[PDB]
Amino acid sequence: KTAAAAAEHSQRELDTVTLEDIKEHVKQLEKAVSGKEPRFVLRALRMLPSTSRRLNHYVLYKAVQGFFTSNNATRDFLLPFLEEPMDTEADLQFRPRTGKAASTPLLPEVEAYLQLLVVIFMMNSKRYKEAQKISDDLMQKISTQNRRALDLVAAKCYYYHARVYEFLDKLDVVRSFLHARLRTATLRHDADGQATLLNLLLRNYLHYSLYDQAEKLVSKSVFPEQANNNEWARYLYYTGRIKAIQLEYSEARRTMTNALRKAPQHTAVGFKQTVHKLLIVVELLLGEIPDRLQFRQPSLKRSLMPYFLLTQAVRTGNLAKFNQVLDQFGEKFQADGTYTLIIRLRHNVIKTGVRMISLSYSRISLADIAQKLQLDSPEDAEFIVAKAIRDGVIEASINHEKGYVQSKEMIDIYSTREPQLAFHQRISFCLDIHNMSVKAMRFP
Amino acid sequence: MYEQLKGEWNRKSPNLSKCGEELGRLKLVLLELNFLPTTGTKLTKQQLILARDILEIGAQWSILRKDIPSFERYMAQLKCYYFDYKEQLPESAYMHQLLGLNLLFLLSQNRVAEFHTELERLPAKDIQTNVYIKHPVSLEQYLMEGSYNKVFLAKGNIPAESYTFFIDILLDTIRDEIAGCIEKAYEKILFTEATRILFFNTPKKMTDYAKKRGWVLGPNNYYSFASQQQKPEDTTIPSTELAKQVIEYARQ
Amino acid sequence: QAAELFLDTVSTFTSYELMDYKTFVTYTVYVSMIALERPDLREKVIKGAEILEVLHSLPAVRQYLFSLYECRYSVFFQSLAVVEQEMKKDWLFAPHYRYYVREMRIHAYSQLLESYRSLTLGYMAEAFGVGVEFIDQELSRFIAAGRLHCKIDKVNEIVETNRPDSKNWQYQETIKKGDLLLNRVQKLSRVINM
Amino acid sequence: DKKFHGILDQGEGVLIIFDEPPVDKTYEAALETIQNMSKVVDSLYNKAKKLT
């Protein structure tokens, strides 16, 4: 019994530590209300998920009954919804509010946090109906109270609300909530809330594959630049994915590499896996040879080994070998949603090989290129090089005599100037850095 | 209300007088309550059934009469009505074929985003089965990879709903594409080169080629005109962008 | 890095550590051959008196080293294959498909086709072994690899090189490094404002 | 050995002799400045201060 008692006492001590973490959060909001500072609010929201992985029904009810010294609707909602365990030997001195503290009404910010903290806890407990009811109470309370600092809270609150509703499969129903809060955010200039709602809306259109509506909305909705880094990364990745579906290739590779760089390197393992698969498929279709250093990713070895064989097949130009491996391990490609593209690469392997061999050779025979890439037909080789030149990917031309192709030339007026023309945005970066400094040099 | 659902449209409807009957159908039956909710009301489910039936009939009439405004209007009505997927209703039959014809002609309108997003809405409808709907996919795949004449022979048959006019409209898009491809950086174009190998053995297409675009016919040969030049560069837009940089870091 | 710190002919023991001083030299020759083609390597390793002595000790090792120095490809390729076979019998075989012979001949072909403009495939084949088709496929494979700055006129079977000028090649290097550092500063712009 | 300035055009059976302008060492010096003023600073500093 000694070992079991010691383990239970230790886990109860960590439960009290988590309660002190929640108490620290409450003190953080007391300071935030006193100082009118939402940045230290953001710190509180940043530090919550770190401790979110280990909570207990009993310690949550402890925090609920302690913080709600004055009777309030939050306590009345949590009393039936939160299912604490049976009697526990451990109790704490619950008296945080006395006198004026109990007399003063509850803070809307801490009310939104308790509601959001309950809905994360219900999902951690794998509950759905109670989570949706708490989240509905959260959006109802945030809608009713019209303070400026609440909408910054409302951004991540609506974010996780629709994430819950995605598990609920109400991701279609929540759209009305997303748009209604979008209109409120438009009225109140809530860029972060707007950023969250479009991200949730785009994931909704992804889960229903509603890409035509997604592109029609992205092409008209302006996204805030100064939004949260995580929300920026999710939006940019979703924009990159839909452009890849839309065949917007150069924009896709730009957006996907930007999204990979914007994502935290230490975290976002699933996001990282998706962006590796996206870059492999899209760049192989482009013929842009995939980055070899990306294969050293410790979390993507098994997923990229067939991708490595796909890269080898793209370079070689063979068909049967990679068709076999797609039949073997193509189900994950279907789950990622690139299998239609996968077949597109399978039949554009010849196009990529033609580009590489055209860059290799000056005047290559149409018979030689057909033999190299398994065309076995002079006319099909002529059509392919015709289709390459009209696409403008390569400079290989056609002379119906034997298949002549022009070579390069020495550097002209603009060939030394196109780098500086495309790179002199350095000062534009300098000026936005300086303007950000001007914004961020508050003395007190 | 629920009158002559397909009374004269199934066997043969070649007359123009049926337009008035269709208009009366729109006024009375198509405008009964709505097409949006489709919550219950199996009567409205049958209303959606007749709506889709008259839309496919209008699609066949429009593609046979070659009226772009009416055909496009029927296409958009077909898309908006089908926006309500109800799985319990019997799918396929009318779905895969019509969507293939609609997407194929949309590619003739040069739209690929709608094509691929519909393909993503159809995970196995396009790849596993339904040659009815993968026929445009195969045509686009060949027309993107390596084929012009092989595309023509592939277009020679439509398994979807026959109606072998989307192949001709794609033939009109590829004559334009071929004309652009030979208006590209090609070195020379013989008269027999333009006439024999690709397509259009001495039709009115030949007169269209000889009169519309440049590359005047030399001796049985069209040749590229002045498109690449040394261009002694006045270099004035580099000066303007230099001034743009100057003003950019002349302040703040 | 290996060569720069490994030409030092100061052994802790007369014949130990790397199994011999002769084995020490063979490692030096292999590393130097991977290192560079023919700058004033005559004044870097060839001038080495101990180097010349140990090549006198090993005639075959002296044979391919002088073959590379003299740029005589007829003996070079046979000796280079012997070198690859010898490296196979060695546990230091890590560049099994990258830098046994392919990198060295990339340097050799660069050395050869530079100071040339259009050297015929048929004659460069016999000046560099035999099997005109073998050299043609080797050139095609290495151009696809990226090096051997040249193109092949297949309809006339010519090797039309494209050597950039000192200005042109260096300008290409700057725009590449500009691309890498724009990627860097964009990453740093991500680091700020978050 | 860079003792001569030309390219051997065997196809034409000639050697094209070119006068190489060596004043273009600003190019290589600039690249060296790019390398040893950016690589040694950006990676080290902004990997040490990953969090900001």
Partner: peptide, 30 residues
């Protein structure tokens, strides 16, 4: 490459130094 970029990099260095100082001041003021 070597005046506009250098100005951008040094300005970036100043900003990230200021951001680090401001973040530390905000976290350790109380």
């Amino acid at each position: 490459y070597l005046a506009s970029l250098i100005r951008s990099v040094v300005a970036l260095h100043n900003l990230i130094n200021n951001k680090i100082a401001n973040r530390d001041a905000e976290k350790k003021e109380g």
